[PDB]
Design a protein around this nucleic acid. Structure first.
Lengths: 230, 162, 118
RNA sequence: GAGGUGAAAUUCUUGGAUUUAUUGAAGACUAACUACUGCGAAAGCAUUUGCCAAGGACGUUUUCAUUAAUCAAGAACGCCGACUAGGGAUCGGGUGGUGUUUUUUUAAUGACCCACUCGGCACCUUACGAGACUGGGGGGAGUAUGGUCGCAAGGCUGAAACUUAAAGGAAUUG
């Protein structure tokens, strides 16, 4: 039949940029389109649900976070800025495919923990059984009771690292990979365990908004702007 | 380590970019130098060059991916068709490799591509329609056919090539 | 100085998709597939079709104001071939050749993680 | 435009398909780790945690005291043997050694290396022994056929009682 004639949809598009929370280094991550702020769907509520997936290397300046992408959820719009909060964390698939080798065991755990806020998080963990230096047998398997005990102490100490953190404290805790060092130190009594990682953090429920808490995560701001000159 | 002395002058004097090997994350990083390197796709071609080499082809085949830029590299798995329990999987890789490599080298020399095959995942590099020809001969053989019949079909596809 | 979109190249067999969206993925800038550039209905996956689709993708991205793209290259995945078609590398090469800067190439095909076969 | 194909097509699609992002629901399934490894009487068994009973090997200066082995019937589930030594690797237990990872006055508890030993799944060898869902014609490769049973040729169709139309076929440098 008859279809449609085009009218260019980039004349009604508005550019915002995304300010990341201050639990990171350099916080301008990029820009985002949205339709122009008309009545009946204003743009500031056409936003506020969008998550962006950025790289932690791009958020932290280094390159040892070249894996480990994270998600930032848009919460509050002010003055052509999208202030975001932490929404999750995930490895790239190539990292854990680069970690998995045969002739070892992968012990993976996960716990659903509610923080010192009322965010509830499903937080994961992977760990691979190392072989010691001077080990001549090619296997280095765990005896599955060592797996249950390792997974037990993984669950206990990382649910101790949450509940004893807020979201900002947990994010600043898992940027420099130090919960992995806690797992390694707490587990070398059982098995050697190379390259423990957290690998995945999911938000499940989020409490309320608390604009004051978000603006204290970012920085202040209030405007009296221009005035019309007639 | 053993092929590094033949890899990088095709990345420095032949092509125009610079290399480093991280022993940090055991990888290869490729920068393009801004002020004298030409060829705005040379970064992508050299990256896919070392990608072919680390994926399993030999270094002359990966140089064949570097020069003559219209050779892509298809990949698939044994597990996608017929689901191949492990005894039948051993039959599959032994059937594709033949005896002393002669069937795989036949599929190589006929349809102009070059293949390599890991334990459950095989890789075919070459030009795209020859890739499709080799892939259909391989998937017929992995579904399980007389190698005389796949030699005859290969003679016909070589007759298309002539 | 760069403005970054993402590339979202989905290169199956029988077709390729070059679909730049913004950094979130909610707003699209010039989805053009492979079968809409030149269609013999079987050359949709071809490197020529992927080069044409990525070239007028990069035309509209330079029109809107995007200078660089983060490349997310996926295959059909699922309970299927799990590796990109002949158009993925061609679309990536044409996106780089046509002015756009490339960053962060990553492979986001859906590995099915215990699938639904039998 | 999307599937899909060697190409196509049925199909979906401007009442927006395919692609992208957020979220929900459903039914399965337990990827890579995954092995000539493990467990189970066999068929079989792979996410976590808990409960319920079970089982095996080992350790034992514990206990009973021949309680035992094989299978027709019946029940549950569904190059050989009576035979010698070895060798490497691996799984479970135990003993000893005495180094490194571990570590400390919260409980006990590892991992690896080595030797020995018991029991397993296999593998590579050795030495020595009579080891005496039922129904069936008779070797392999061929060859001939004055036998028996079959199937099969002719010859332009129309068209035969009719030398018969139209049209078609065949061959055709009228």
């Amino acid at each position: 039949g008859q279809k449609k004639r085009v009218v260019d949809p980039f004349t009604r598009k508005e550019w915002f940029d995304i300010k990341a929370p201050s639990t990171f280094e350099n916080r301008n991550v990029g820009k985002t389109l949205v339709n122009k702020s008309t009545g009946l769907k204003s743009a500031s509520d056409a936003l506020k649900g969008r998550v962006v997936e950025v790289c932690l290397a791009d958020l932290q300046g280094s390159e040892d976070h070249s894996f480990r992408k994270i998600k930032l959820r848009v919460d509050e719009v002010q003055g052509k800025n999208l202030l975001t909060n932490f929404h999750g964390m995930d490895f790239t698939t190539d990292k854990l495919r680069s970690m998995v080798r045969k002739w070892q065991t992968l012990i993976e755990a996960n716990v659903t923990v509610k923080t010192s806020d009322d965010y509830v998080l499903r937080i994961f963990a992977i760990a691979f059984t190392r072989k010691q230096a001077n080990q001549v047998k090619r296997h280095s398997y765990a005896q599955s009771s060592h797996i249950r005990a390792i997974r037990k102490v993984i669950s206990e100490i990382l649910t101790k690292e949450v509940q004893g953190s807020t979201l900002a404290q947990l994010t600043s805790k898992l940027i420099p990979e130090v919960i992995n060092k806690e797992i390694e130190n707490a587990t070398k009594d059982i098995f050697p365990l190379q390259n423990i990682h957290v690998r995945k953090v999911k938000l499940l429920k989020q409490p309320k908004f608390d604009v004051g808490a978000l603006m204290a995560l970012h920085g202040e701001g209030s405007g009296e702007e221009k005035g019309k000159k007639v | 380590r053993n092929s590094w002395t033949k890899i990088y002058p095709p990345l420095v004097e032949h092509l125009k970019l610079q290399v480093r090997m991280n022993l940090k994350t055991k990888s290869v990083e490729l920068r393009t130098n801004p002020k004298f390197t030409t060829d705005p796709g040379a970064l992508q071609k050299g990256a896919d060059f070392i990608k072919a080499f680390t994926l399993g082809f030999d270094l002359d085949d990966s140089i064949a991916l570097l020069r003559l830029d219209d050779l892509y590299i298809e990949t698939f798995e044994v597990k996608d068709v017929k689901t191949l329990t492990g005894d039948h999987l051993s039959r599959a890789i032994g059937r594709i490799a033949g005896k002393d490599g002669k069937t795989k080298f036949a599929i190589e020399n006929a349809t102009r591509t070059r293949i390599v095959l890991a334990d459950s995942k095989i890789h075919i590099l070459g030009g795209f329609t020859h890739i499709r020809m080799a892939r259909e001969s391989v998937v017929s053989l992995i579904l399980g056919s007389p190698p005389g019949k796949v030699y005859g079909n290969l003679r016909t596809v070589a007759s298309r090539l002539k | 100085s760069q403005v970054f979109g993402v590339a979202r190249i989905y290169a199956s067999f029988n077709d390729t998709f070059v679909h730049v969206t913004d950094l979130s993925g909610k707003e699209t800038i010039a989805r053009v597939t492979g079968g809409m550039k030149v269609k013999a209905d079987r050359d949709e996956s071809s490197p020529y079709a992927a080069m044409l689709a990525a070239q007028d993708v990069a035309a509209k991205c330079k029109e809107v104001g995007i200078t660089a793209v983060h490349v997310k290259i996926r295959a059909t995945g699922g309970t299927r071939t799990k590796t990109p078609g002949p158009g993925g590398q061609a679309a990536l090469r044409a996106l780089a050749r046509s002015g756009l800067r490339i960053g962060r190439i990553e492979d986001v095909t859906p590995v099915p993680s215990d699938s639904t076969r039998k």
